[PDB]
Design a protein around this ligand. Structure first.
Ligand code: NA
Lengths: 455, 455, 453
C-alpha cells in the first residue's frame, strides 16, 4: 500500500507538470523562458489566486489585487532584443481554473495546489526576516529559528498546520489572544463560539508539536482557560523559549517549483508509473537533472542566488548549515553573508540592468529525513541566552519548574538526515558526515535580510 | 541669495587654506610634509587652542597642556635621513591668533574655527568607541549609533549642537541631572538660574531632533520638571531607545582637513569666486583632486586608514555601510574589521618603525544629502533588541504607550543619499543604487576600537 | 637560591621524560608513534589514574572505567599497513606506579603528576565549552572567559586551585551552597565541620584572586555567613560580573605534553643540570625544537589543530588573541573559526578515514608572564553588557555600590615580548597589534560541550 501512495503523489506531480507545460504554450514562452524561475512563480501564483476566491486559503492577495477580483496574473519575463522585457498578464480566474483541472484529467487536485503553496512558504522562510512581526507580538527576535511557515495564508488550515513551526503557532495565538483583550464581546455570543473552537484547535496542533509531557501539559492549561489574557500570553512566551532547547516536531516538505516538474514531464516521464516520494531521493534526482534559470540583479552573486533556491527546495532554512554544507559539497553560508535578495522582482525595479544566470541546484550527496552513530553540535550563545531568560520574574508553576529542569539537563539527542552517495540509489551504505566546524551553524546568524511585511 | 552664501562659505575655506599655507612656511615643512595629515591636525589644534583661551569651546585641553597657558603646539613630523622625526613645537597663542586673522584679511573668521572643530569631531566619531561613557550614564552600549559629535567640547554652543546626535544629548542631560541629584543647591541661586536655563535649552535642542509629535511631547514633560531626578533619567533612556527606530534629524557637515583646503589654495583657487557648498559636489571634487599622506604604524592596512579618513571627511560613520560601499565603489567595512588605529600618533609611540603612505580618498560616485524610488533596509537584531526592552517594568504613560505603538508599527519611510556620476556635475540623472547585501549595514557592528576617554 | 628551584623543576621535567621513554619502549611504539600527541594523552592518563586510587585527586574516572578498578589504560594508535590502528591497552595500576617511580629514581614525584594534570586542564579549557554548566548554576554564559581550570578534579589540592579562575570558584561555591540549601545536616556534625572548613577555604582562595579591597570585603561577608543560601548565591553572581571588568589574579602554568619532554630526554638532555623554568623562555625553546604529530579527522584544518595545541601548551585560551597573534606571528583565530574538534579521538569514531599531520608549534617571539609603555585594548560589548546588568533589582549594600563605582570608572595580566635571538630578555618589544582580529578566544564560540561524553 506504500506504493499506492507513491502513485497518487506521482499523479499530482504529473498534474503540476502537465499544467505548467500548457501555461508555457498559453503564454508563448521559449524553452529558456519556461525554465526561468521568475516566470514559474507568476504561473504558480495565478492558480492559487484562481482557486482561492478571496478566501486567503492558497495565497494572500494585495489590496490593489482586489481591483478586478474576476482576473488574476502577474509579471512575465521574456528575452527580446538582448534585453529582458517585463509585461503584466491578466487571465480570468475561471479560465485558469479550467486549464488546471484539464491538466489533472478533470480532477480538482487540491494537493497539487497545496504543493505549490508550501513551495512558496518555503521560499519566503529562506528569504525574508520576521523579527518585526515577533516584536509586535511581544516576542524575542532571537526565536527566528522557530518561524517555519510563518508566511502561510491566514486560512490554510489542514495543509499549513503540518509545516508551521512552534513559534509560528505561538504568534497566531498571541495575535488572537491580544485581540480578545481589547473587546470583551470577542469570546461571547454566536460569533465567539467559532473563534473559541479555532482557539482549541490551534492549541492542540501546537501541543502535538511538543514532544515532552511537560510542554504538552502547559498547553492544556492554556487551552482550558475559558477567558485568556496576559497570563496565557506569558505562558506561550515561556513555551516558545523551551522550543529552542526542547525542539518540537515540525514537518518539512521538499516542494520544487512548477517549472522543474513541468520540464521533467516535457521530456517524457510518467510520475504516476514510477511513483514519487518527497521523503527520499526523488527530489534530489529531479534537481540533479534539472535546468532552471533566474533573473539576477547587479551586485548579486549567482552562486548565492542558487543557494537560496536550493535551500528552499529542500526546506532546509531551519537545519544546521554544517550538515547542509556536507550534503551540498559546498559551504552553505548563513543568510547574512549572501549577496542576494528575494527571487521575485518588484514592480518598481528597473529591467534595463537585469541579467540571468544558471541556477546551481546539484548536490554531492542526497539525504532522507529521519525524525547509527550520531554526532551532536551545540547551540550558539544567542539561542542559549534567549531560552534561559525571563524566568526570574512573573508566573510560577510546577510545570514551569519541570520544563526548566528538562531544559538545563537537555541531552544532545530529531529531524535528522541520513546521507548517502548519489551512486547509492537504494540507500545501502549510510555515510557518517564529517563537518567543517568553522562554518556557522544557524542560517539566521547575523541575519540582515529584508523584512517580509514590506511590499 | 543662495550664491551669496556660497561666496561667504568660500570665503572661509579660502581663509583656512591661506592660514595653512602660512603655517607650512612658518614651520618650514616640505610639500610632502604639508600634505601629511598628522601635521594638519597639529596645525589645526593650535588655532583652536589659541582662540579657546581655556574656555573648552573649540577643543578640550590636557591637564598637562595647562602648564604654560600662554603657549600652544604639538607634534610636527618631518622626514629626515630616511626616518620620521617628531618634534614638539610651541608658539604663543597671541602669535597664532595674529597669523589666523592675517590669513582671513583681518577678520576673526569664527566659522573657520568651527569648521576645523567639526572636522575633529567627525574624525573622533569615526575612530573611537564610546561604550564606557554610555555605561557611566546608565545607557545601553548598543546605542553607539546615536553618538554623533559625542566628542565635541562641553562648552561648544550653537554650532556643535546641530551636529550632536540624539544619544549625545541624552548623555549630557543625564550627566547634568545626576549632578542635580547629588547637590540640592544646584537649581538654586545665580548658578541655579543659569543652569536651569541651560537645561531648558538642551531639552529644546533635543526636542527639535525628534520628528514625531509623541517624542517631542515627552521631551516637553522632561523640561517642565522644575526639579528633575531619576524619573527624568528613565524617560530620557526610553526616548533614546525610541531614537533607534524613530530616528531624529541630525545634521552632518562634510569638513575636510586644513591641508586639503591649503593645498587647493597653494596651486591657485579662489573659493570666494567659485563659491563652495558642503551640501553638494564641492567636497567630492576636492577629495578626487586631493593628495594627502598619513603616517602608518606596523601591521596597519593603509587602505583601512584611507577608509577611516574618507569616512570622517564625509561624516558617514553613522550611515549605512551598504550605501557608502556603493558610492565609494569599494567595500566600506565595519570598524571592527579595520586594521588601523587612530590617525594621531601618541607621544609614547616609537618613531623608528613609523612609515607613511598615500591616502586613497577618491570615490566612484558623489552624493548629496537628502533629508524617486527608495529601497529600505532592515535594522540588525542588536538594534531591535536594544530598542524594544525595559518597557515591561517601571514607568508607563499615555506618551510611552503611544511611542511604542509607533515603534512597533514603524514603516521604513531618516536621511538618505542621492547618488550621481562624477561625470554628472549638474546632478541630471539620479542613480538607483544596487547594494551588496552580504556587507554589514552598521559601522559599529562588532566594534573593537579604542575607548575615547583614554589618553 | 633561584637556581635551586630551576634544578628541582628540571628534576621533574627529566622524570616525565624518563617515564615517557620507558612507556614507549613498554608499548613498543615507533619514533613517530611516540611523537603522536594522541598516544601521549593516553600514557599521561594512565599515570594519573594509577596514583589517583579513585580519590578524584589527579583525574576523573568514567563510570565504566570503574569496572575493573585495579587496571588502567586507554587507546593506543599505531600505523600498520598504511592505516591507523586503535587498540585498547590495560595495565595494573601498581605496575604503572612502579614504572613512574622508577623513572624518577624511586621518588614519588607528585609535582610531575600535577604537571600533567594541569596540562590536561589547559587542553580542556582551550577545547571545550562550559556554557551549559554555567546555566545549571544560574550564571551568565558570557562569563566563559572566567573558567580557567573549570575541568580540574574535585579533590585537586593547592596546585590546582592556583590555576582556577574566578568564575570556576564561584561555580564550585554556588554548587556547594545549593547543596546546603537542600539538606540542613550539611553544616552540622563531623561532615558539617569539614564541609564548613572547605567552604571557608574556597572563599579565602577566591578572596586572594581579587585585587581590589572592595571585592575582597564582599567575599568576607559571604564566608562569615554561618548558614548561606540564595542571598550569598546572588552576591557571588555579582562578584563574578565584577571579575569581567576588574579581573582577578589567576596563575597560568605552561605545561607541555609528555612526548615533548620525552623526546627531548631521548636525544640527551639533563634538565637537572640546565634547570627549567615555566616562567621564561624554556618552554618556548622546547616548542621551537619540538616535533609532535597529531591524528586529524576529515574536513579538519591541521593548522587549526596546531593552534589548539600551541594555545593549550602556553595556557593562552583566556588571553587576548591580538597579543597571541603578535607572539605567534600568525593570526590566532577565535575558537569558533577553528575547523577542528578535540585532540582526543572518541571510541565511537571510525579509524579508516583518520590521517595524521605535523603540529606547527613554533612562535615568532617568546614572552614572559608579567603580572615600559603599555597599550590597553577595550572589552567587547558582550563583556560590557554581561558585567553591567542585574544591579537594578535585589540586594544592595555599601560594598556593591563601591564595586560598581570602581567598575564604571575602571582605568586600564600582561605579556613581555622578546625576540628569540634575545635569550637574556635585553630588549622588550613594543607590540604592534592587528586591530581587525577579534580579541576574545570565545567570541562566537561553537565548540562541543565538556559535559557531553
Ligand atoms: Na544577506
Amino acid at each position: 500500500n506504500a506504493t499506492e501512495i507513491r502513485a497518487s503523489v506521482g499523479k499530482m506531480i504529473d498534474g503540476i507538470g502537465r499544467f505548467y507545460i500548457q501555461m508555457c504554450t498559453e503564454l508563448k514562452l521559449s524553452d529558456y523562458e519556461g525554465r526561468l524561475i521568475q516566470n514559474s512563480l507568476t504561473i504558480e501564483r495565478m492558480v492559487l489566486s484562481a482557486f482561492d476566491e478571496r478566501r486567503n486559503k492558497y495565497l494572500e492577495e494585495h489590496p490593489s489585487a482586489g481591483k478586478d477580483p474576476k482576473k488574476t496574473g502577474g509579471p512575465i519575463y521574456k528575452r527580446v532584443d538582448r534585453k529582458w522585457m517585463r509585461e503584466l498578464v491578466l487571465y480570468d480566474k475561471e479560465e485558469i481554473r479550467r486549464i488546471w483541472r484539464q491538466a489533472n484529467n478533470g480532477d480538482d487536485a487540491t494537493a497539487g495546489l497545496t504543493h505549490m503553496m508550501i513551495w512558496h512558504s518555503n521560499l519566503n522562510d529562506t528569504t525574508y526576516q520576521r523579527t518585526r512581526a515577533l516584536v509586535r507580538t511581544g516576542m524575542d527576535p532571537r526565536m527566528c529559528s522557530l518561524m517555519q511557515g510563518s508566511t502561510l495564508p491566514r486560512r490554510s488550515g489542514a495543509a499549513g498546520a503540518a509545516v508551521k513551526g512552534v513559534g509560528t503557532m505561538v504568534m497566531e495565538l498571541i495575535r488572537m489572544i491580544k485581540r480578545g483583550i481589547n473587546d470583551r464581546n470577542f469570546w461571547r455570543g454566536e460569533n465567539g463560539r467559532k473563534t473559541r473552537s479555532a482557539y482549541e484547535r490551534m492549541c492542540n496542533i501546537l501541543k502535538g508539536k511538543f514532544q515532552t509531557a511537560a510542554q504538552r501539559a502547559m498547553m492544556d492549561q492554556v487551552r482550558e482557560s475559558r477567558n485568556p489574557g496576559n497570563a496565557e500570553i506569558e505562558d506561550l512566551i515561556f513555551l516558545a523559549r523551551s522550543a529552542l532547547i526542547l525542539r518540537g516536531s515540525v514537518a518539512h516538505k521538499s516542494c520544487l517549483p512548477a517549472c522543474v516538474y513541468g520540464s521533467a514531464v516535457a521530456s517524457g516521464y510518467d510520475f504516476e508509473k514510477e511513483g514519487y516520494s518527497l521523503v527520499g531521493i526523488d527530489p534530489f534526482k529531479l534537481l540533479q537533472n534539472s535546468q532552471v534559470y533566474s533573473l539576477i540583479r547587479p551586485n548579486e552573486n549567482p552562486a548565492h542566488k542558487s543557494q537560496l533556491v536550493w535551500m528552499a527546495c529542500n526546506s532546509a532554512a531551519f537545519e544546521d548549515l554544517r550538515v547542509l554544507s556536507f550534503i551540498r559539497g559546498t559551504k552553505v553560508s548563513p543568510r547574512g553573508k549572501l549577496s542576494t535578495r528575494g527571487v521575485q522582482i518588484a514592480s518598481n525595479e528597473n529591467m534595463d540592468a537585469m541579467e540571468s544566470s544558471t541556477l546551481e541546484l546539484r548536490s554531492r550527496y542526497w539525504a532522507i529525513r529521519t525524525r547509527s552513530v550520531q554526532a551532536n553540535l551545540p547551540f550558539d550563545k544567542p539561542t542559549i541566552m534567549a531560552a534561559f531568560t525571563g524566568n526570574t520574574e512573573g508566573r510560577t508553576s510546577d510545570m514551569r519548574a519541570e520544563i526548566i529542569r528538562m531544559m538545563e539537563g537537555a541531552k544532545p539527542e530529531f529531524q535528522g538526515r541520513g546521507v548517502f552517495e548519489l551512486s547509492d540509489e537504494r540507500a545501502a551504505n549510510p555515510i557518517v558526515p564529517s563537518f567543517d566546524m568553522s562554518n556557522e551553524g544557524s542560517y539566521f546568524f547575523g541575519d540582515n535580510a529584508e523584512e517580509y511585511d514590506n511590499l
